[PDB]
Amino acid sequence: TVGIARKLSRDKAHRDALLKNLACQLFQHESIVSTHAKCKEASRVAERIITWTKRAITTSNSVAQAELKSQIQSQLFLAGDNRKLMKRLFSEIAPRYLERPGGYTRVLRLEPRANDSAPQSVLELVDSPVMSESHTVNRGNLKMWLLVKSVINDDANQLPHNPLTLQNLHKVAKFKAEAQLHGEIMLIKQVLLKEMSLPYDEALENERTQALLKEVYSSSSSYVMVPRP
């Protein structure tokens, strides 16, 4: 009751409802901006919900599965824009995370908001699909977009990629088919380059992407450690 969670200056009933709302909004819009503390708590709920959904999907035990389903239902507000949220959770969202052991969200810190000095953050779903089956781009996966923008900038400058950038790319890849990842990167480039107004010679960009993928995939002192005399 003290120390188990953030209180967030709200009465228990209100607080829980707020958290549910945040979770629903995260599932609907695959990224959302909010205050840092709220985001942190919301992540805990959303992740829990995702795991329960995964458990329901997997389990052979029928009773268990039913219980998981009931728990998931309890943890959401299913109305208006979130009428078919349960369906989405089972069919669209939870199947992304079957291999991933936890860590389905990422809270990314922003510069604190000016009017309030409140620490601001971006709660968002990990490995959200950047491109739907229709020829559009999807709202979400901000980190990936940022990475690709950084890559583009490095290419423009004719500089080597930073170790941190490479590490991030590797992390992104870990639960991604290589060809799919490449195609996503290419798609992101097309939009990003146009926005920034750099020229998109396609074959060269593809080659660069391929090169970036290759280095990611193929893995390759002051004090001396000496035994006791």
């Binding site: 922003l110 510069e111 781009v137 940022l146 950084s150």
Partner: protein, 112 residues
């Protein structure tokens, strides 16, 4: 409960500015953004790049505006007859001039 004397210039100033707690600190923890080579806070996203990405998302993930057929296919004269102009209130006018009271985000300096 109440101050016994007029607090002097010295004693108010040493109270306010003497302690380091009360002073402002240099923001040493700035560093370069990898997407655009500009200043940003450490362990923080660049507000320009994330803003740009948000804008991109908005432009792509855009719910189409509902233009009713009957109003779209009105004649100009007919439209004027139906929906004439009006004097807005002082309050309304003030609300309309958003650039007076609404702060757009500033761009940081380019890192060296």
């Amino acid at each position: 409960a109440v101050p016994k004397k007029k607090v002097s210039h010295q004693k108010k100033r040493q109270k306010l500015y003497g302690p380091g707690k009360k002073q402002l600190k240099m923001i040493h923890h700035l560093n370069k953004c990898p997407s655009c080579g500009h200043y940003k806070r450490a362990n923080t996203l660049c507000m320009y790049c994330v803003g740009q990405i948000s804008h991109i998302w908005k432009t792509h993930t855009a719910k189409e505006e509902i233009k009713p057929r009957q109003e779209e296919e009105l004649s100009e004269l007919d439209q004027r007859v139906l929906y004439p102009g009006r004097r807005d209130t002082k309050y309304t006018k003030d609300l309309k001039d958003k650039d007076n009271y609404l702060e757009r985000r500033v761009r940081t300096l380019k890192k060296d």
